[PDB]
Each structure stands twice: as C-alpha cells, then as structure tokens.
Amino acid sequence: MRIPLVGKDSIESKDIGFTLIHEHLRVFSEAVRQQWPHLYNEDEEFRNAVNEVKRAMQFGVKTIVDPTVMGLGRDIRFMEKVVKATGINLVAGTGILIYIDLPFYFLNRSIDEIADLFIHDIKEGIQGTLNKAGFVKIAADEPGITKDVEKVIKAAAIANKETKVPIITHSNAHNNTGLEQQRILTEEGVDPGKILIGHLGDTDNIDYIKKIADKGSFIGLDRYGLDMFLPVDKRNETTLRLIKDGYSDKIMISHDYCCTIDMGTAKPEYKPKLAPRWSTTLIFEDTIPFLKRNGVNEEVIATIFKENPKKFFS
Amino acid sequence: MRIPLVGKDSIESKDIGFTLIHEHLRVFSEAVRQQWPHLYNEDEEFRNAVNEVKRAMQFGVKTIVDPTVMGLGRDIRFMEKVVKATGINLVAGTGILIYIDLPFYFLNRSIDEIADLFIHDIKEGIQGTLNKAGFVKIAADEPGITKDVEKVIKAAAIANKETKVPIITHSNAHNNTGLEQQRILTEEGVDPGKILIGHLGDTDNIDYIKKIADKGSFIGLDRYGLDMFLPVDKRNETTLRLIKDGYSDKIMISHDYCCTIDMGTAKPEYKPKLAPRWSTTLIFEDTIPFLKRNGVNEEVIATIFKENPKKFFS
Ligand SMILES: [Co+2]
Ligand SMILES: [Co+2]
Ligand SMILES: [Fe+3]
Ligand SMILES: [Fe+3]
Secondary structure (H helix, E strand, C coil): CEEEECCEEEEEHHHCCCEECCCECCECCHHHHHHCHHHCCHHHHHHHHHHHHHHHHHCCCCEEEECCCECCCCCHHHHHHHHHHHCCEEEECEEECCCCCCCHHHCCCCHHHHHHHHHHHHHCCCCCCCCCCCCEEEECCCCCCCHHHHHHHHHHHHHHHHHCCCEEEECCCCCCHHHHHHHHHHHCCCCHHHEEECCHHHCCCHHHHHHHHHCCCEEEECCCCCCCCCCHHHHHHHHHHHHHCCCHHHEEECCCCECCECCCCCCCCCCCCCCCCCCCCHHHHHHHHHHHHCCCCHHHHHHHHHHHHHHHCC | CEEEECCEEEEEHHHCCCEECCCECCECCHHHHHHCHHHCCHHHHHHHHHHHHHHHHHCCCCEEEECCCECCCCCHHHHHHHHHHHCCEEEECEEECCCCCCCHHHCCCCHHHHHHHHHHHHHCCCCCCCCCCCCEEEECCCCCCCHHHHHHHHHHHHHHHHHCCCEEEECCCCCCHHHHHHHHHHHCCCCHHHEEECCHHHCCCHHHHHHHHHCCCEEEECCCCCCCCCCHHHHHHHHHHHHHCCCHHHEEECCCCECCECCCCCCCCCCCCCCCCCCCCHHHHHHHHHHHHCCCCHHHHHHHHHHHHHHHCC
16 A cells, blocks of 8 residues: 655555654643643744654654544654654654544544544545545544544544554553454454554453454554553563564554653653663663673564555555 | 723723623633544634624623533634634633543642642743633532532632633532532632622522522523523523512523534424524523513613623632
8 A cells, every 4th residue: 555644645555664653743632732832832832843853863763653543642743843843754644642532523423434534544644735644543442442532443443444544552451452353443344454442552461462453463663662551571571582582573563752742741650771762762762772691682673673564544 | 990802902891891701712621632633624714713703792782601621622813813803802710620530640749739829820821821721610520529629619719819811610509509509619718709600590599599699699691502401491580580589680691602623413302482593692682672671771781791791700
C-alpha cells in the first residue's frame, strides 16, 4: 500500500525504513489548552519536538508514527511544521483515545457516525488539510471495555475494512484490555496482522504477551523509559526472552516519548541505579546495545524496526 | 460590587437590569471541534447567536449571563464579537463542567491548582484577553459527587472566597446533587446567597426545590423550553406555586438556550399540544403571560429578573 506522510507525498510501504512506531511530538488535553492557553508555550513545544526528531534521525530513524489523536491534542499543522524543520517521514493517524465515556458531542450518535470521522481523516484529510491519516488509534485502560470504548473499537474496525489502514491500540497491560481489543476487532473482520496491541511492554507477564502475538497481532513493547510502568532492565529481559523464543516477527519497540506533555508530574521514585533518560533515542543508548551483547543479531533488529512496520502498513 | 462584561467596562451590580441568568451563545465539545472542524460552521453559529441576542433585547433584556466554561466550548473572542454586533451586556464565567473525571491534564494536580485557573480568569482575564470572569460554574449530574466533581466544587469555593464572584451550578434535579453542591460549598465558607443551584426547574418536586431555597440559595428554574426535562406547563405550575408560597426572592428563571449546540439530536416526542419553541424569548411568549393572567404582579417579575440577579452579583 501507500502510506500518507505529513507534509510529503505518500510512500510505498517497502520504503518506510527504520521506524519508531509509537512516539508523540506533543500531547495536551484539548479542553485545557483551549480554556487556559497561559499554561502552554508553543515555541518551546516546537523546539522540543524538532530537537528530539533530529536526534532520532542521527541514529538512523527514517519514519516516526505518531498516534496523537482526539483526547491527546492532535494538531496536524504543528506536525507539518516539525516535518518542514527536520525532513522526517511522519505518519499521522485518526481515532479517539478515551477510557470511560465519549465527549458530549457523541450523545445520540451511532458507531457509523464515529467511523465516518475516521474515514474523513483517511480519505479527505486531517483538520482541513490534505494531510491524510495512515492508521486508526483506539484505547482502553483500567475501566475496561465500557460501552463507549466498545463503540470506538467497532468504528475503528469499520474504518479499517473500508480503507485498509492498520490499527494501533493503547491498552492497560495488567488487565486483559489488549486481549479484548484484539478479539473484538477480529470478530468484526479485522486481520489480526493489521493490529498493534499497545503497552504490553508494561508487564513482564510473558504468557499474556505471547498469547496476543500467537493470535496474530503485533505486540507493543512501546514504553521504554517509563520506569513507572516497568523498569528498563525488566523490559529488556522480557524483550530478550521473547526474541530468544522466536517472537521477533511480532515485536514492535518504541518509547511513547512525549516531547512535551501537559499532565501533572507524578511523585518521583529513586532507585539504586540511575534513572534512565526517557526520550526517542533511549533504545539506541540502552536496549539495542543490551540485545546485541546478549547475542541478538542485526537481522533481529531489522525485523523489529523495518520488516514489522513494513508488514503492518502493507 | 462591579461585574465584568465582555467587550465593555465593568458595571455596578445595581445597573444589571433585566437579566437572563443562564443562556449559551454557543456550546461545543472542545476536543471534537479541534479534531473535526468540518462538523462546524462558525459563520452560522455567529449569525444564530446575534439573532437570538437581538430578539432578547427587543423584549427588554439588558444582561445575559453565559455559563459556557471548560467542557462546553467557552470562546471569549466569539463572545466579544457577539457583544460588538448587538450591544448586549454579557457576563462570562470561569469553571469546569464535568460529570465524572477531569481531563488527563489534571492528573497529580491539587484543588489549589484548579482554583488558580479560575482566579486567573477572574483577576487577569479569559483566554489571553482582558475580559474577566464574573462567576464560577460547576457541575454534577447522574454520576453524583465523584472525587473529581468534589475537587471542582472545592476549587470554586476557594475562588469565591478570594474574589467574591458568585457560583452557578449545573445539577441533576432528580438526585440530590444540587443539595450536595450547596452543602459542600457552604461548609467551605461560601455564602448560600452567592450560589445558584441549577436545573431545579427540571422537577416538579416542590419540597426538594423549597429545601434548597430555604437553605439560602437561588433556585434555577432555568430550562424553559426543554420539554425533555419537564414540559412548559408543569414548569409554569411549579413556578406559580413557588411564587404563591412566597419564594419569589429565591427564584431565577432562564431557558438554558443554546444558540448552537453540537450534541446529537435525541429522538423527537410529539404530544397533544404543539411543542413550545425553545429559545431565549420563550418566557416572554409563554411563561410571563401565564403568570400575569394568574395574578402574578409586576413586582414579582422585577424581583425574579432584576432584584435577584442584582443581589446575586452584589
Ligand atoms: Co497510550
Ligand atoms: Co447545565
Ligand atoms: Fe502514546
Ligand atoms: Fe447550561
């Protein structure tokens, strides 16, 4: 297939190259930014995103997939400015990130109406531009598969069947929300190989992770650097074990890094070892060197960062 | 006190004149408008608001209080354009309308931080303008007094104690959310006479309505025309009974009219009598004529629409 890119002509999926599948140029709550602009500094957000993207490119990253959608402050014009300043291939998406209920707008509205919003972004363009969405992003977390969460999942299935774009999820690794997302999507006719079940790297429960991979979907070991969810060393051991056991062709690795994010800062926790620097390049500083010196060869690295994204977007 | 007005110098509260205490120039879900602008037409929204405001002014309305805040799409620049086009006195507010949880921005943030946002809008101005907020708006509905709902209530109390602006609420008339809002605010030191408990006209449970008025707060008979909550005739009978029983000095009347609103349309219900035309002038067409021909004198009308707002803002 051809993948739409922000600020560029679309590319063939075979040309995606080395990809970070889950990173955020910027995240914010739409209602807070609209109501209290004094809390934000767009110039700093722009500088932060440009600098992070440039650093990723210096390590060989060719494409970044950014699943900032409704609920996380997607801004296609900000994204296109970052592209112009860096030259990155940037894949933007459509979708909705909620944990409980949809915004009031959606009262009395059908799953088809929700799907039409996603299809609009895929076929016509995002936010009044010709930049088109290349995937759909959906979520579930601690509250489980609520009524409105299910509506969004089913709308993503409709958009995938109509346009063939893949689906990226946010899940909570400690309930079975990821497993439920996969099942609900596949029951609607979505190819399991067109789904990335997100945030599975937040657990060391390898049997749960493997169960989802064995059902055909990519597994998101996608929060490297967020020690609050799982420390880097345990993520590395889980990643290494999955590679040793033959799961390279389902593994996707990223950081979920937010070059800026507006949420309040949680209480710091200090451990014996110096805290890792969460960024878009931590895997080049820590994870990839760790895998290599544990015997993981170059072909595994190419599978995870090139072949798997290529398949996902094919 | 002096009441700040959008696009005008502040006025003494004695000069507020005939007031509609709860009307919306425009409502939308911030995240949906940001992500799917194709669903909206600002020129139509502007025309609708200007035309409604002009009609209200033709019946003698001097001031409109608009409690559109975070969660309902407050836009101070849109409001100031409507003022420029009409000459209305418009009171804008600050606050947050949620039913369950706050946006992700508020994770790990204190009640004091929330109050600081409201105080910023009151003292410094709304959305980067010098238009200042003249009241705080808070909500609770079917989910009851959740953790985050309580946080917003307590933040409104802090803002009221610091700045002396009054508090308008949204409640669900069929639970005791309005009674709970009143109690929580008064326990924090808010004068009950600085509170309007909203949406009480949605019930004909006169004992519940009177209980709140007797605890010192204004009662919002504030959704005239929304037959889905309560039909006009039963609202009129409840209003008349409250007047007959001596409650004029606590009654506030409005329509909650939204000149535009983005929410999906509920299923229509057709009754034997022609449905009333919900607008900002329905009370001049129906309610006020009904009260007068049932013996309600001009002094009652002046109490409800002039003296009560004056007290509320004093
Ligand atoms: Co996520
Ligand atoms: Co309300
Ligand atoms: Fe993310
Ligand atoms: Fe309202």
